[PDB]
Structure formats: structure tokens, C-alpha cells
Design an enzyme around this catalytic site. Sequence first.
Site, PDB file in Angstrom:
ATOM      1  N   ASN B 186       0.638  -1.259   0.162  1.00 31.18           N
ATOM      2  CA  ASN B 186       0.079  -0.104  -0.056  1.00 31.18           C
ATOM      3  C   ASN B 186       0.847   1.346  -0.100  1.00 31.18           C
ATOM      4  O   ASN B 186       0.421   2.352   0.276  1.00 31.18           O
ATOM      5  CB  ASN B 186      -1.195   0.131   1.168  1.00 31.18           C
ATOM      6  CG  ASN B 186      -1.707  -1.082   1.344  1.00 31.18           C
ATOM      7  OD1 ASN B 186      -1.733  -1.515   2.763  1.00 31.18           O
ATOM      8  ND2 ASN B 186      -2.234  -1.979   0.569  1.00 31.18           N
ATOM      9  N   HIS B 188       2.877   2.217   1.949  1.00 30.49           N
ATOM     10  CA  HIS B 188       3.143   2.795   3.482  1.00 30.49           C
ATOM     11  C   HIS B 188       4.973   1.968   4.081  1.00 30.49           C
ATOM     12  O   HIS B 188       4.720   1.021   3.536  1.00 30.49           O
ATOM     13  CB  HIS B 188       2.316   2.531   4.319  1.00 30.49           C
ATOM     14  CG  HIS B 188       0.850   3.387   4.220  1.00 30.49           C
ATOM     15  ND1 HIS B 188       0.798   4.147   4.778  1.00 30.49           N
ATOM     16  CD2 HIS B 188      -0.136   3.017   3.309  1.00 30.49           C
ATOM     17  CE1 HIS B 188      -0.472   4.924   4.397  1.00 30.49           C
ATOM     18  NE2 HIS B 188      -0.743   4.336   3.335  1.00 30.49           N
ATOM     19  N   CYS B 223       5.835   7.495   9.414  1.00 33.39           N
ATOM     20  CA  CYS B 223       6.828   7.972   8.575  1.00 33.39           C
ATOM     21  C   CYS B 223       6.360   7.848   7.333  1.00 33.39           C
ATOM     22  O   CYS B 223       6.078   6.767   6.641  1.00 33.39           O
ATOM     23  CB  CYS B 223       8.436   7.509   8.551  1.00 33.39           C
ATOM     24  SG  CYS B 223       9.391   7.964   7.811  1.00 33.39           S
TER      25      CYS B 223
END
EC number: 3.1.2.14
Lengths: 265, 264
Positions: B186, B188, B223
Site C-alpha cells: 500500500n 506505507h 513516517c
Amino acid sequence: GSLTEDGLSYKEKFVVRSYEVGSNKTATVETIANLLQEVGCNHAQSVGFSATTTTMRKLHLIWVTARMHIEIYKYPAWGDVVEIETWCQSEGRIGTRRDWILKDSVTGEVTGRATSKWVMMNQDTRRLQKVSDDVRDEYLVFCPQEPRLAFPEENNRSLKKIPKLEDPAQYSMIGLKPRRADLDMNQHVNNVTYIGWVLESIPQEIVDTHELQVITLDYRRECQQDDVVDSLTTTTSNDSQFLHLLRLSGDGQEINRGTTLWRKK
Amino acid sequence: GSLTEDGLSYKEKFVVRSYEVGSNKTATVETIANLLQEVGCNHAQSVGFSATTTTMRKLHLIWVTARMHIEIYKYPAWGDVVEIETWCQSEGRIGTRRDWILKDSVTGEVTGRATSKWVMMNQDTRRLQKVSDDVRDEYLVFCPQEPRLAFPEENNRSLKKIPKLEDPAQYSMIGLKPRRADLDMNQHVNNVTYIGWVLESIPQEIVDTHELQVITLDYRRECQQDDVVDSLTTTTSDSQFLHLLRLSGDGQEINRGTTLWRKK
Ligand SMILES: O=c1[nH]cnc2c1oc1ccccc12
Ligand SMILES: O=c1[nH]cnc2c1oc1ccccc12
């Protein structure tokens, strides 16, 4: 994993993991390169190595990668079983070659192929050398005698000369540093990390609309644990081609050069 | 891999790979955390989460990690077979918990254990939420009803409050950035990358003479792909350290943690 019937090649099956896939839910080229490295190590173990021979350990000699070339037709999906077959071949006094064929376990079709060139180097002085007769005889009993090539074509991409990127680069990714996960068991940067660093300077729009078909990477010098690298890319071209360069952030010492070919999804 | 006989837990065997080991020729803590993540995903798939439920997809809700705690007694050697058993449990309206037990396949002995706390979050607004009754009902059919904990000891390390590191830090590793291999499907940052970043500020001499025994990591904020992180460490003592990950710019906290190391 196991050696084939004749004992001149090795096969292993892998189930693609959730963390090993990208945005398309298929394996990344770095996952593929890690699997090639793993089946190569399992092949070396099955025939009695630890890829140093008896004579190599006596003379403080090692095999180092000079070039890696990978061509992918279909990246395996998450949960899929990919079967990889690998074998080695002596190339006279120049060095050795390790080749791979990747297949879909369910269909039996070839989904990828790879080839790598290895040179002899003294572990301590870092000086390259030709292969000695004693070393050649030692590994010929584990290699097919007649040529067996993953890339047999007359003018194939795996043996093309790669030029040096001229400044200014079209794209760049600056200040890249290895962390402990990037190191191998001997505390040297893993060869696959350099492939990731080359790809960092490819723009996100290319990654989002294209699939990587071919990557050819030359290894010139190692990146030390405390070194910092700059990744540079320039478009050279339905298909997109790029010219790549990895160099140390400080003095600009070349560590790698390469080319990638991408096809529109 | 497969669900156990009662269908309330899942087991999977893994052969430790050449690139997965460190200088001691045994699996790194990041390899272990990736394997825990893999068996967790395979468990979710086996019970039909192909870990969002039907109600969660309609309400744009996801499970996010709040805390990961891992204790290793023996790291598996290269070529060894490690068997991991995992299960989930609802913790009322607070969230859910995923637990793991790691065993040596040959001896059958416990070589590690882990526990993680998960909270409900709206994937768009990023606002944490309590667990609704409809979601709890959908989860209860796949979880053991009586408590089953990997860390049962009353007042144990997995539930300890972690303080915020005070500046100046004893050690630091600055300018850490994620690359594409650090991202999940995804886009991330993978949760395991944060563990690697925490460990980057541990000095090399500690790594060379000690083995990591326990790691407790709190997840406060994500992050982003284009963010830069600073990793900070201070000795609090066996060797014990206090850790902090924060953005290089504004100094916004992303993680805090503690590690315990034993002399080899
Ligand atoms: O142990 C090594 N000594 C010298 N050169 C190298 C050694 O490991 C390597 C791994 C990759 C490339 C060069 C080296
Ligand atoms: O899709 C997401 N939206 C918002 N927060 C997150 C999402 O995926 C994640 C994965 C890990 C942590 C937070 C998030």
C-alpha cells in the site's frame, strides 16, 4: 531444494511472501534477486562449498560479482509458487558464470531468466586475478561440460557494453546509506541493495505506469558500511530505457553503472 | 502453513535464508519480525480477511500497530526450520492483540515469543477509534474465548510504560530515509523498518559482543515515503537502552522504545 538427476544444476521452490511484493501485489525485482542469491547459496552448499573451494581458502581468494543481468516476463503474485533452476559454468581464465531460469510452478512456463559474471579476487589486497588451472579443475566436476546458457541469442542484452552517465543527470537520489539489514553475514553490503539504490532515482510515475522488464548492472567497486551513495538516472529512449550511475557522495568515485528497460502496463 | 485443529490459531514453518542472517550466522530480529508479519497475514487469509472485516471496509476503518514486543532466547541458524504459532484476541473496546510463539522444529522447544497491540483507525482522517460491537462480534468467532497470552506473567515487560528520551542522546544515527524496498504493497513504510532504524543508533561494539534479548517498540505516528528520521539511544543500565525515532526537521516523535541485551 535439490540437485537435478545429473547433479549439474539445482532447483528450488519459493512461496512469494506478503512483505516481498510491491503496489501491483507481485514480487519486486529485489525480491527476485534475493531468491536467485538464496538458490545460488543452496546449490554451493549441496556440492560442498562454504563459494570458496579448498585452493581458494588456502590462497585467500573469493568470487566477486562483476555483472548481474535479469529479464522478467511475469512477476509472481503474492502467494504464488515460483521454481528457480540454477547452474554454474567456467569461462576459462576470465572467471565463472551463474545462470538462472524462473518458472511458474503451476503452468511450468518460463517467467524470468538471469545471468551473472563472477571474477576471482584476493580477499585482502582486493586485486583481481585470472582463474588458475587447479581452481578450474575443482569446479568443472559440478558444471555442465557443453555450453548451457540462459541467454543464448547472437546479440543479446546481457553482454552489451554500458557507457558512463554524463553530468548533469536527468534524475537523482542523494545521500543513500546502508543500514545493518543491508549487510550480509560478512558485514559487506548485499549485492541486491545496489539494485535498490539504482532504482531509487527512477521517477515514481515510471514505476506507477511501467513494469521493469530488463536490468543490467555492472559492479566496479564496493560501498563500505560507512560510505554514502548518490544514484543518478537519465532517459536514453511504448518502451522506456534509462542509463544509471551509482557513485560515492563525496569524491564521486564510481561504484556501479547500469541500464533498465521498462514496458507500459 | 495451516490453522490448528480447533481453528483458533495458525502454524507455519520457515527455513532461515542466507540473506536473512547477521554476523553470528543466525536470523536478525528484523528477519524474525518479517516472519511474524508473514504468518499473521497467512492467518488472516485462512479465516477470510482477503485484516479488515466486512464492517471495517464499509466504514473506511483499518487496524494499525500501537506496540510490538519481542523476546528471543535463541535466534535460528541459517538453514534451520523455525515453527511459528499465532493467534488473535479482542481486548474489549481498546483494540485487538496478536500473539506469537516461536519454536525450534527439531527440538520442539520455545526459542522466542512476541505480542502486539492493534488499534482501530479511520484510514482517511487518521482518527483513532474504540472497537464497535459489530466488529467485536465478527472477530470473536476466530479468537480463543478464554485468555491465551504469550506473556502471562503479572507485571511483565510487554506492558511497561516507556519514557521519552531527554536531549542530549548518548548515541544517534541521523538522516535515515526509507527506499522502495522499505514500503509495503500500500506504499506505507513497513513496521519492521522502524525496528531497523531504532537499532541503527546502537553502537557496533554492543552488537559485536551482545545478543538482543528483548525489544519493546511504541508506534506513535507514521513516517511518510518522503520523510527523514533521526534515531536516538541512551544507555539506562546486561545492557539496557532507551530509544527515540523523530523526524529530522521539526523533531516530531514517530516511535519510542527499549532494548535489553545479554553478553555473548
Ligand atoms: O570479505 C571480503 N573481502 C574483500 N572483498 C570482499 C569481501 O566480501 C565481498 C563481498 C562483495 C564484494 C566484495 C567483497
Ligand atoms: O491507508 C492508510 N491510511 C492511513 N493510515 C495508514 C494507512 O495504512 C497504514 C499502514 C500503517 C500505518 C498507518 C497506516
